[PDB]
Every structure is written in C-alpha cells, then in structure tokens.
C-alpha cells in the first residue's frame, strides 16, 4: 500500500557495444520458423506472457 | 494506494553502439516465418502478451 | 489512488548509434512471412497484445 | 617505376559507431594546452610531419 | 621497380563500436599539456615523424 | 625489385568493441604532460619516428 522506489531499473539493457564482421550469412527456411540476430532488447509485462526470441515450428490440427 | 517513484526505468534500452560489416546476406523463405536482425527494442505491456521477435511457422486446421 | 512519478521512463530507447556496411542483401519470400532489419523501436500497450517484430507464416482453415 | 594497386587503403577509418552519455564535462586551462575528444580522424602526409592530437605546453625563450 | 598490391591496408581502423557512460569528467591544466579521449584514429606518414596523441610539457630555454 | 602482395595489412586495428562506465574521472596537471584514454589507433611511418601516446614532462635548458 506504499512503494517508495528511487533509481529503480526493471528490464533494462544499457552500455552495450557489439561488432559483427561476417563475410556471408545465409538462411534457408522451408516450412518452419527461424529467429536469428536479436540484440539489445528489453521489456516488461504485467499479467501476460513475455517472449523475446521464440520460434515455433507450426501448429497442426 | 501510494507509489512514489523517482528516476524509474521500465523496459528501457540505452547506450548502445553496434557495427555490422557483412559482404552478403541472403534469406530464402518458402512457406514459413523468418525474423532476422532485431536490435535496440524496448516495450512495456499491461494485461497483454508481450513479444519482440517471434516467428510462428503457420497455423493449420 | 496516488502516483507521484518524476523522470519516469517506460518503453524507451535512447542513445543508439549503428553502422551497417553490406555489399548485397537479398530476400526471397514465397508464400510465407519475413521481418528483417528492425532497430530503435519502443512502445507501450495497456490492455492489449504488444508485438514488435512478429512473422506469422499463415493461418489455414 | 610501376605500381599497380587495386582496392588500396592508406590512412582510413570506417565502420565506427560511438555513444557518449556524460552528465557534466568541464575543462579548465590556465596557460597550457589541452586536446580532448578526438574521434574518427584519418590523414596521409608525404614529406612532412603528421600529428593528430598534439598538445604542446608552450615554447619559452 | 614493380609493386602489385591488391586489397592492401596501411594504417587503417575499421569495425569499432565504443560506449562511454560517464557522470562527471573534469580536466584542470595549469601550465602543462593534456591529451585525453582519442579514439578511432589512423594515419600514414612518408619521410616525416608521425605522432597521434603526444603531450609535451613545455620547451624552456 | 618485385613485390606481389595480396590482402596485406600493416598497422591495422579492426573488430573492436569497448565499454567504459565511469562515475567520476578527474585529471589535475600542474606543469607536466598527461595522456589518458587512447583507443583504436593505427599508423604507419616510413623514415620517421612513430609515436602513439607519448607524454614528455618538459625540456629544460
Ligand atoms: C498502466 C499502469 C501502469 C502502472 N505503473 C505503475 C508503477 C510503477 C512504479 C510504482 C512505484 C514505484 O516505486 C516504482 Br520504482 C514504479 S502503477 C500502474 C498502473 C497502471 N494501470 C492504470 C493499470 C490499468 O490496467 C488496465 C486494465 F487493463
Ligand atoms: C608515398 C609512397 C607510397 C608508396 N606505397 C607503396 C606500396 C605499398 C605496397 C606495395 C606492394 C605491395 O605488395 C603491398 Br601489399 C603494398 S610504394 C610507395 C611509394 C611512395 N612514394 C612515391 C615515395 C615518394 O617519396 C617522397 C619523397 F619524400
């Protein structure tokens, strides 16, 4: 019934330096799911599912 | 019934420096889902699902 | 019943520097979904689903 | 007496991403020399001295 | 009397990502030389002295 | 009398990622030389002295 927060950080990404030197990147997808190259991502979810890099193949019935 | 927040950060990305030197990038998708190259992303969701880089193959019935 | 927020940040991206030197980028999609190259994105959602880079293959019935 | 150069690079800076988040920067100089904050600099000198960030105090006689 | 160079690199800086989060930077110089914060610098010198970040106090006589 | 160089690199810096989180940096110089914070520097010198980060106190006579 009383929250007192100072300099609070929830779901934060800071101070990031990345270098990527690639000569050839290739992705070949046939019918499925592919998630590649996710960087510097942050989030906060209240009463819900929280996903960042989720690959689901498929949903058959 | 009483929140007192000072300098609060929820779902934040800051201070990011990225370099990408690629000679050839190629994506070939046939019927599925592909998510590539997601950087410096932030969000906040209240009573809902929160997804950033989600690839779902398909939904068959 | 009483919120007192000072310098609050929710779903924020700041201070970002990116360089991309590519010689050839190619995407070939046949019937599916492709999401490539998402950077410096931020949002906030209240009572709803929040998606940033979501590729869904298809919805069959 | 014969040079054949292809894709030659001399004194080159490329593909650089920098971020600087400072709250207070202060310089106080009394009688001398100060060089601060030099980034992404390139040069080429033929028959001459080549200096980038040189601070000389003074020259007395 | 015959040079054949292909994809030659002399004095080159590439693919660099830097982040600097400082709260307070302060320089106080009284009579001397100060060189601070030199990044991503490249050069080439032929028949000459080559200096990047040189601080000389002073030259008395 | 015959040089044949392919993909030659002399004095090169590449693929560098640095992060510096400092709360307080302070330099106090009285009469001398100070060189601080040199990163990602490259050079090539022919018939000459090559110095990167040189601090000389002073030259008295
Ligand atoms: C959207 C929202 C956001 C939100 N953020 C808060 C405090 C963060 C904090 C509080 C205290 C602290 O000390 C610190 Br640090 C941080 S309360 C709050 C309430 C709400 N709503 C109105 C919910 C309505 O639901 C919609 C129905 F579907
Ligand atoms: C400036 C210069 C630069 C230079 N760079 C060369 C080859 C690099 C290389 C050669 C062969 C290789 O296989 C490779 Br890898 C790399 S020759 C050359 C000659 C000269 N001059 C004209 C000298 C004139 O002097 C001025 C008098 F003060």
UniProtKB/Swiss-Prot annotation, chains A, B, C, D, E, F:
Describe the effect of residue 3 to F: No effect on osmotic stress-induced phosphorylation
User: Coiled coil where?
Assistant: none
What post-translational modification information does the record give? Phosphorylated, predominantly on serine residues. Phosphorylation by CK1 appears to occur on residues distinct from the residue phosphorylated by other kinases.
**Primary location:** cytoplasm
Q: In which tissues is it expressed?
A: Highly expressed in presynaptic terminals in the central nervous system. Expressed principally in brain.
Q: What is known of its domains?
A: The 'non A-beta component of Alzheimer disease amyloid plaque' domain (NAC domain) is involved in fibrils formation. The middle hydrophobic region forms the core of the filaments. The C-terminus may regulate aggregation and determine the diameter of the filaments.
Q: What is this protein called?
A: Alpha-synuclein
Q: Per UniProt, what is the name of the gene that codes for the protein in this document?
A: SNCA
């Amino acid at each position: 019934v009383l929250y007192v927060g100072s300099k609070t950080k929830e779901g934060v990404v800071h101070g990031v330096a990345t270098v990527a030197e690639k000569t050839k990147e290739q992705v070949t997808n046939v019918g499925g799911a592919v998630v590649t190259g996710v960087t510097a991502v942050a989030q906060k979810t209240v009463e819900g599912a929280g996903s960042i890099a989720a690959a689901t193949g498929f949903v058959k019935k």
